Amino acid sequence: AKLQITLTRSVIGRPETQRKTVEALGLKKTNSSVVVEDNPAIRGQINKVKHLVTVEEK
Amino acid sequence: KKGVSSTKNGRDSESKRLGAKRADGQFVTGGSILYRQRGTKIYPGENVGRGGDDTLFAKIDGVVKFERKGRDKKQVSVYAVA
Amino acid sequence: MLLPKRVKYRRQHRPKTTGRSKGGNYVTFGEFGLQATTTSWITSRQIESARIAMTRYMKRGGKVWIKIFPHTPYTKKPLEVRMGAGKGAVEGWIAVVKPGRILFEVAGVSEEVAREALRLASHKLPVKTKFVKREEL
RNA sequence: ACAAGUAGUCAGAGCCCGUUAAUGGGUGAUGGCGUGCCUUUUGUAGAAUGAACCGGCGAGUUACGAUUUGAUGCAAGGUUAA
RNA sequence: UAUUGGAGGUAGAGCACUGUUUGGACGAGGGGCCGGUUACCGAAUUCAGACAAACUCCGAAUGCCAAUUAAUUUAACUUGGGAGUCAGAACAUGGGUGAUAAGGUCCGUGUUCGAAAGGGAAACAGCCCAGACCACCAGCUAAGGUCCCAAAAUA
RNA sequence: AAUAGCUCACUAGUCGAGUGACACUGCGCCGAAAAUGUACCGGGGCUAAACAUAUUACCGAAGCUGUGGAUUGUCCUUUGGA
RNA sequence: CUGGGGCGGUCGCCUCCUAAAAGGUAACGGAGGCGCUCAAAGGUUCCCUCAGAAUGGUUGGAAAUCAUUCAUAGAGUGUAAAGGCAUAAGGGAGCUUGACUGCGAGACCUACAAGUCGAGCAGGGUCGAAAGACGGACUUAGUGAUCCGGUGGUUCCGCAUGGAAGGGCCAUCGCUCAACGGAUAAAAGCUACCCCGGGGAUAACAGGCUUAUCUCCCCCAAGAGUUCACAUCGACGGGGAGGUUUGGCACCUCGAUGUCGGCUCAUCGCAUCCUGGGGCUGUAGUCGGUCCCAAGGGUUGGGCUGUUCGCCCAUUAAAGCGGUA
RNA sequence: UCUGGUGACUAUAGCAAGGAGGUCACACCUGUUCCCAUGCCGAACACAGAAGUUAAGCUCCUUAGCGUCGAUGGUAGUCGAACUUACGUUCCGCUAGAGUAGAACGUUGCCAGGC
Ligand SMILES: [Mg+2]
Ligand SMILES: [Mg+2]
Ligand SMILES: [Mg+2]
Ligand SMILES: [Mg+2]
Ligand SMILES: [Mg+2]
């Protein structure tokens, strides 16, 4: 339904791909966060860069 | 810097940017090259022609679709509804 | 089991030595055999040498099958030369072994004699080995 | 006057002083951190180069023409040169 | 990014082609001799094995091109004025070259340094973590750690 | 130099519980010699202060929060706050 | 250009692999070709299918030609290689000249100049019954800007005017300008008499990395040694240590790090030359050989070469091997 | 579904072996006068016929011997991550090829006569 994503790891030292994905999710700085609606399109991006972020059911 | 030792193979040509030029699903205008080749990796199909250089170009406007011919060949088609 | 009689191209890119045995992992001809557990390049002089050792011990009793053939040529540049100016000339023929490959097969001789012969062969050889019997069951 | 120091900073007792009065000035036992500056380089504490120290002097300006931008006239016209 | 559609022949496998190869069947040619016999030797034909950057009956992962299209983001292109750059470096990974040498050399793909301070690695441009607008004698953590030097478990 | 042959083929009995081999592994041992001074833990030192597998704390940055302050940009006008 | 120059090789085009399954991608990397050829080896219409193999035979060097069933093309395609090809793009045969003129929507490539592919529209053809197909060779090399000069058209300009000389335009010719984006129409050398500006961007010295070579150590144990692998010595092979040699790399030093021998002075390692302790032995003791522990000390004087080294003459208990720019 | 045309489909479609059959359709056939047929053959090609004949080509049925198709599961490889310098290890996706079962002796539109 609704989930919460926070950038827990830094984006320095990661390929441009992973940083672009992080840009697409709308996360700006380390430990920044956003709330978006559960959606296979969004899950595709979280799964691609799960090692930098974390999820919550909020 | 060594001396007299010399090799008889330091030569090559300029590669030709062959291969695909359009994909399944995009609107090509007529004349658009779809696949520059040698011999026939892909034969022309509907509304597609064969250049002198084995080049494949659309006859008319439309979408492009790659398909199978028999058991191991490929052709190309163009369809106009747009 | 020394050299290919002819090859098309004689200066070949060196072989990949990372992974597992594509095949030849079973005793097909022999009764007891010898497989490898590391990887190295095995040269013709080493194979010939391990063979003489094995077959001196068996005292011309039973048969032997060498399962590795030296196919790849290798190059070495002439001495005291700088870098560049082409590729060097062929110095020997090789055949890459990787963990699992059987290197020698034997039959028609008792088990202990075969094990001793393959032991003596193992020391003339640059790869860790293992004694194996014809897989059954 | 038992100490190992690119010489500062930061933390601080003790001792003297008192201002452009403000949460003040001088010195600093002792602790923490800390290899000048320029040039040139992939990279310089560099044992690469340059300067002993102070002071003065010491390097993208001007003429004419083009191009572009800003500004200002007035506009199917605008403008004079000798 | 999710979902469709497609070009291509790498990794891996495989021997159907070009070859490279180890054993075993099976009949036979010039020829041991008198066209000969038998050994063989040059192959034909099989069965089991294997090898390959310039082999492929096969064939991924991923990259790439595009969509009737979605969802999240915020760039993108055109014209004009001004440039600097053409000595790169190391790590990780796919390869050539060398000797499966080099802090080697030449490419591809990231990252970092260059042009990056801060914490860790004793010290240590390139490694790990992380990008410094300016205070504060506030708080939480990452990599690394918690007996003393030296903040934290002699858990 | 013929040979001198006891003991583990072999067990009653000295007497009475065990004893060959095999794999596949976890951690060590040997192989192991170089030049000013320990000198191949940063030092002390460590039988855990090593290693493995869990668990729970805490420290740790100029990262990220907290409070105050610049300076630009985009919004609301909350002409002020975001 | 160049793993410093020099010497050798190379320089433009096409094909293949390296190239990591789009495209692209480098090395003095691994392989080869081109500077043409075809008036049919072009266009079109209609026909036809191949190499080899045996069941084989007038020849039968074997297989020439001929025969017959299988032949996935294993053959041919003018040439290098790679993609293709029985729709045949392969092989005949008949007509033929499209190996057209004027162009081109669009696309590919791409710094530029160039290069590549084009449906279609006119003009006039060829072949075919027609539909159609044909702006060269199955595709991809077979090439060279400009300036200049020549030749043929055109009748555009042409210096008061009419002509003309000269230009312009269109067509074409003349380059191993091959160092192939071509400095000129025209060009080889030595400087130890050298000079200036630069560089550790780049060599000689040593420092650093590596350890191919080099010194030493080991492992396996055929074997020699009466017998006997293992007193000693150890082949074929295999694994290492060291950083003393010959090198490789080009990282500090060219606004200077004096380089070889000898002299003076040493200092440190031990893989020990003597001396001390031992295990051994194919050691009866003296003898020697081997291995282990050992670095405290000691470890000559001369002849010959600049020599280090090495040889030689006398001694000594020994006349050690290396690091230290 | 017969029977003959003519598209369509990756041979699951095919090859072989066996067994039938002619519903006047198909062939083989029988001839060269003709249009024609050449190089080198009336073979072919063209044509004129129908006496013959299921013998073959053909069609229908059987059979997996061959060819073809081919999963599940496991494995190799690999995107990403975290360790690490090992000819590596772990976690997570994706996921071959070979082989094994099996599939399979085709379906099929239209047109014309059939029944
Ligand atoms: Mg200085
Ligand atoms: Mg100094
Ligand atoms: Mg000075
Ligand atoms: Mg000078
Ligand atoms: Mg100086």
Short mmCIF file of N, CA, C and O (backbone and C1' of nucleotides) in Angstrom, two decimals, chain D residues 28-55:
data_model
loop_
_atom_site.label_atom_id
_atom_site.label_comp_id
_atom_site.label_asym_id
_atom_site.label_seq_id
_atom_site.Cartn_x
_atom_site.Cartn_y
_atom_site.Cartn_z
P G D 28 56.17 32.73 26.32
"O5'" G D 28 55.46 31.60 27.25
"C5'" G D 28 56.18 31.07 28.39
"C4'" G D 28 55.22 30.32 29.29
"C3'" G D 28 54.76 28.95 28.77
"O3'" G D 28 55.48 27.97 29.49
"C1'" G D 28 52.88 30.29 29.53
P A D 29 55.84 26.58 28.84
"O5'" A D 29 55.74 25.58 30.08
"C5'" A D 29 56.50 25.83 31.27
"C4'" A D 29 56.04 24.96 32.42
"C3'" A D 29 55.59 23.55 32.07
"O3'" A D 29 56.70 22.68 32.03
"C1'" A D 29 54.04 24.55 33.56
P U D 30 56.87 21.67 30.83
"O5'" U D 30 55.46 20.94 30.73
"C5'" U D 30 55.20 19.71 31.42
"C4'" U D 30 53.72 19.41 31.42
"C3'" U D 30 53.11 19.05 30.08
"O3'" U D 30 53.37 17.73 29.63
"C1'" U D 30 51.71 20.59 31.14
P G D 31 53.49 17.47 28.08
"O5'" G D 31 52.01 17.05 27.63
"C5'" G D 31 51.35 15.95 28.29
"C4'" G D 31 49.89 15.96 27.95
"C3'" G D 31 49.53 15.92 26.46
"O3'" G D 31 49.52 14.60 25.94
"C1'" G D 31 48.33 17.65 27.49
P G D 32 50.01 14.33 24.45
"O5'" G D 32 48.77 14.78 23.55
"C5'" G D 32 47.56 13.99 23.60
"C4'" G D 32 46.50 14.67 22.76
"C3'" G D 32 46.85 14.93 21.30
"O3'" G D 32 46.62 13.78 20.49
"C1'" G D 32 45.99 16.89 22.25
P C D 33 47.73 13.28 19.48
"O5'" C D 33 47.51 14.21 18.21
"C5'" C D 33 46.28 14.16 17.47
"C4'" C D 33 46.11 15.42 16.67
"C3'" C D 33 47.22 15.72 15.67
"O3'" C D 33 47.06 15.00 14.46
"C1'" C D 33 46.72 17.68 16.89
P G D 34 48.32 14.30 13.72
"O5'" G D 34 49.09 15.52 13.03
"C5'" G D 34 48.36 16.38 12.13
"C4'" G D 34 49.13 17.66 11.95
"C3'" G D 34 50.62 17.52 11.66
"O3'" G D 34 50.85 17.15 10.30
"C1'" G D 34 50.27 19.24 13.23
P U D 35 52.15 16.36 9.90
"O5'" U D 35 52.97 17.41 9.03
"C5'" U D 35 53.73 18.47 9.64
"C4'" U D 35 54.97 18.76 8.84
"C3'" U D 35 54.75 19.12 7.38
"O3'" U D 35 54.54 20.52 7.26
"C1'" U D 35 56.49 17.50 7.58
P G D 36 53.56 21.09 6.16
"O5'" G D 36 53.92 22.64 6.09
"C5'" G D 36 55.26 23.00 5.68
"C4'" G D 36 55.37 24.50 5.68
"C3'" G D 36 55.02 25.19 4.36
"O3'" G D 36 53.62 25.38 4.20
"C1'" G D 36 57.07 26.00 5.13
P C D 37 52.85 24.89 2.86
"O5'" C D 37 52.92 26.15 1.90
"C5'" C D 37 52.73 27.48 2.41
"C4'" C D 37 53.47 28.46 1.55
"C3'" C D 37 53.32 28.27 0.06
"O3'" C D 37 52.06 28.73 -0.41
"C1'" C D 37 55.57 28.71 0.56
P C D 38 51.59 28.35 -1.87
"O5'" C D 38 52.27 29.48 -2.76
"C5'" C D 38 52.20 29.40 -4.17
"C4'" C D 38 53.51 29.79 -4.81
"C3'" C D 38 53.85 29.02 -6.07
"O3'" C D 38 53.09 29.50 -7.15
"C1'" C D 38 55.73 29.01 -4.70
P U D 39 52.04 28.54 -7.83
"O5'" U D 39 52.84 28.01 -9.10
"C5'" U D 39 53.66 28.90 -9.86
"C4'" U D 39 54.95 28.24 -10.27
"C3'" U D 39 54.83 26.97 -11.10
"O3'" U D 39 54.65 27.28 -12.47
"C1'" U D 39 56.48 26.69 -9.43
P U D 40 53.50 26.58 -13.31
"O5'" U D 40 54.03 25.09 -13.50
"C5'" U D 40 55.19 24.81 -14.29
"C4'" U D 40 55.83 23.52 -13.85
"C3'" U D 40 55.02 22.26 -14.08
"O3'" U D 40 55.11 21.84 -15.43
"C1'" U D 40 56.00 22.19 -11.93
P U D 41 53.81 21.34 -16.19
"O5'" U D 41 53.13 20.36 -15.14
"C5'" U D 41 52.85 18.99 -15.46
"C4'" U D 41 53.53 18.05 -14.49
"C3'" U D 41 52.73 16.82 -14.10
"O3'" U D 41 52.85 15.84 -15.12
"C1'" U D 41 53.74 17.77 -12.17
P U D 42 51.57 15.08 -15.67
"O5'" U D 42 50.82 14.63 -14.34
"C5'" U D 42 49.41 14.37 -14.35
"C4'" U D 42 49.08 13.31 -13.34
"C3'" U D 42 49.62 13.54 -11.94
"O3'" U D 42 48.77 14.46 -11.24
"C1'" U D 42 50.04 11.31 -12.59
P G D 43 49.31 15.71 -10.44
"O5'" G D 43 50.02 15.08 -9.14
"C5'" G D 43 49.22 14.32 -8.21
"C4'" G D 43 50.12 13.40 -7.43
"C3'" G D 43 51.29 14.07 -6.71
"O3'" G D 43 50.88 14.60 -5.46
"C1'" G D 43 52.07 12.17 -7.89
P U D 44 51.36 16.04 -4.99
"O5'" U D 44 52.93 15.86 -4.83
"C5'" U D 44 53.48 15.07 -3.76
"C4'" U D 44 54.76 15.68 -3.24
"C3'" U D 44 54.64 17.11 -2.72
"O3'" U D 44 55.17 17.18 -1.41
"C1'" U D 44 56.46 16.91 -4.22
P A D 45 54.21 17.05 -0.18
"O5'" A D 45 55.07 17.65 1.01
"C5'" A D 45 55.11 19.05 1.33
"C4'" A D 45 56.29 19.33 2.21
"C3'" A D 45 57.65 19.17 1.54
"O3'" A D 45 58.21 20.40 1.06
"C1'" A D 45 57.56 17.81 3.47
P G D 46 57.95 20.97 -0.45
"O5'" G D 46 58.26 19.74 -1.42
"C5'" G D 46 59.45 19.72 -2.21
"C4'" G D 46 60.58 19.10 -1.44
"C3'" G D 46 61.61 18.35 -2.28
"O3'" G D 46 62.93 18.58 -1.81
"C1'" G D 46 60.52 16.84 -0.80
P A D 47 63.74 19.86 -2.33
"O5'" A D 47 65.17 19.27 -2.71
"C5'" A D 47 65.99 18.61 -1.74
"C4'" A D 47 66.44 17.27 -2.26
"C3'" A D 47 65.32 16.24 -2.41
"O3'" A D 47 65.51 15.43 -3.58
"C1'" A D 47 67.02 15.38 -1.02
P A D 48 64.59 15.62 -4.88
"O5'" A D 48 64.61 17.18 -5.15
"C5'" A D 48 65.62 17.77 -6.00
"C4'" A D 48 65.04 18.19 -7.33
"C3'" A D 48 64.85 19.69 -7.53
"O3'" A D 48 66.03 20.33 -8.00
"C1'" A D 48 62.87 18.56 -8.16
P U D 49 66.72 21.47 -7.12
"O5'" U D 49 66.60 22.77 -8.05
"C5'" U D 49 66.17 22.67 -9.42
"C4'" U D 49 65.16 23.75 -9.71
"C3'" U D 49 65.30 25.02 -8.90
"O3'" U D 49 66.30 25.88 -9.47
"C1'" U D 49 63.01 24.39 -9.04
P G D 50 67.21 26.88 -8.55
"O5'" G D 50 66.20 28.01 -8.07
"C5'" G D 50 65.88 29.10 -8.96
"C4'" G D 50 64.80 29.92 -8.31
"C3'" G D 50 65.08 30.41 -6.89
"O3'" G D 50 65.94 31.54 -6.83
"C1'" G D 50 62.95 29.48 -6.94
P A D 51 67.25 31.47 -5.96
"O5'" A D 51 67.17 32.79 -5.08
"C5'" A D 51 66.38 33.91 -5.50
"C4'" A D 51 65.44 34.33 -4.40
"C3'" A D 51 65.99 34.20 -2.98
"O3'" A D 51 66.84 35.30 -2.70
"C1'" A D 51 63.79 33.35 -3.06
P A D 52 68.38 35.06 -2.40
"O5'" A D 52 68.43 35.05 -0.81
"C5'" A D 52 68.10 33.87 -0.06
"C4'" A D 52 68.20 34.17 1.41
"C3'" A D 52 67.42 35.38 1.88
"O3'" A D 52 66.12 35.04 2.32
"C1'" A D 52 69.67 35.56 2.58
P C D 53 64.85 35.78 1.73
"O5'" C D 53 64.33 36.68 2.93
"C5'" C D 53 64.78 36.48 4.28
"C4'" C D 53 65.05 37.80 4.94
"C3'" C D 53 64.36 39.01 4.34
"O3'" C D 53 62.96 39.07 4.61
"C1'" C D 53 66.59 39.57 4.77
P C D 54 61.95 39.87 3.64
"O5'" C D 54 62.25 41.40 3.96
"C5'" C D 54 62.00 41.93 5.25
"C4'" C D 54 62.26 43.41 5.29
"C3'" C D 54 61.64 44.21 4.15
"O3'" C D 54 60.28 44.52 4.39
"C1'" C D 54 63.90 44.82 4.38
P G D 55 59.26 44.64 3.16
"O5'" G D 55 59.68 46.00 2.45
"C5'" G D 55 59.63 47.22 3.17
"C4'" G D 55 60.34 48.33 2.44
"C3'" G D 55 59.93 48.57 1.01
"O3'" G D 55 58.72 49.29 0.90
"C1'" G D 55 62.28 48.61 1.16
#
